Amino acid sequence: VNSFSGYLKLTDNVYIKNADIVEEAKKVKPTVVVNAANVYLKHGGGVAGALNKATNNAMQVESDDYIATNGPLKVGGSCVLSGHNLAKHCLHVVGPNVNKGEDIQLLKSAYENFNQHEVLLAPLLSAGIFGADPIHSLRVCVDTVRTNVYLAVFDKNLYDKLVSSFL
Ligand SMILES: OC[C@H](Cc1ccccc1)Nc1ncnc2[nH]ccc12
Ligand SMILES: [Cl-]
């Protein structure tokens, strides 16, 4: 039993809810919140920009030190950093950004990072400003993640289409 509330159960391990991931993380304080990161951990917009704003830019400061030490992430890769005031940890995961021409096949690799954590609060990878079809992203999530994932879809209209169209 966990403290996530109001989700629809898509599968044995995948749940979905119309919610602002920022407000969800603040309420639940999950062990792991997933960020829709880029390889530079530049959290300028989308989910990343909003999560960073909620940390008063502490996420960006920590991320800049991480990049200075380690260099950029790989597309499809991840790193674990602090969750600041939002969660214990933040799993920064880089899904492909179609608006950069990045290979969409890497979306499965991106979701595989979730399997290293027993329970996660997450957005749909490569959705929003990363340019992928959120319906496809949900399918890859369900077919790749085996740990317990609580998906937050900010857009209510998009949420209804994902649920109604889910096979
Ligand atoms: O896939 C991630 C989606 C992308 C999206 C945004 C808008 C319309 C359609 C798709 N973004 C978010 N999901 C959950 N919480 C969020 N907080 C801020 C952004 C955000
Ligand atoms: Cl977005």
Side-chain angles (χ1 to χ4, degrees):
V1 181
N2 59 52
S3 61
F4 288 106
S5 174
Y7 287 77
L8 179 67
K9 184 167 176 59
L10 294 178
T11 67
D12 178 76
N13 65 298
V14 177
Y15 292 79
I16 194 167
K17 173 186 186 179
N18 169 225
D20 183 349
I21 191 172
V22 170
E23 293 307 317
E24 275 289 286
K26 284 193 288 185
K27 181 71 174 186
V28 176
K29 309 222 202 307
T31 303
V32 180
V33 66
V34 173
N35 182 32
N38 60 48
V39 299
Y40 310 112
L41 304 177
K42 290 304 183 192
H43 308 302
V47 168
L51 287 173
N52 178 50
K53 178 177 175 185
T55 75
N56 184 42
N57 210 51
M59 177 179 286
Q60 190 64 67
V61 171
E62 178 195 31
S63 293
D64 287 353
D65 171 83
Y66 176 92
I67 296 287
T69 297
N70 301 108
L73 295 179
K74 300 169 180 179
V75 179
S78 70
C79 67
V80 179
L81 291 171
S82 179
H84 301 276
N85 52 317
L86 302 177
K88 187 170 192 293
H89 306 286
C90 179
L91 181 69
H92 295 272
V93 180
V94 183
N97 187 328
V98 174
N99 301 317
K100 299 180 181 178
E102 290 169 351
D103 189 6
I104 193 60
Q105 308 300 311
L106 291 168
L107 187 55
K108 187 173 185 74
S109 300
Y111 275 117
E112 286 171 344
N113 294 285
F114 289 25
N115 290 321
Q116 301 294 317
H117 302 277
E118 287 196 341
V119 183
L120 314 88
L121 171 63
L124 288 171
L125 297 183
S126 299
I129 68 177
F130 282 63
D133 184 352
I135 296 179
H136 169 67
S137 182
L138 177 55
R139 187 76 257 165
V140 178
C141 181
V142 165
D143 293 340
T144 305
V145 181
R146 299 178 299 284
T147 55
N148 290 328
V149 57
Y150 290 83
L151 291 167
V153 177
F154 176 64
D155 190 75
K156 168 62 177 174
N157 285 326
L158 175 56
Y159 170 81
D160 288 347
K161 186 186 184 194
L162 293 161
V163 167
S164 299
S165 63
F166 181 70
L167 188 53

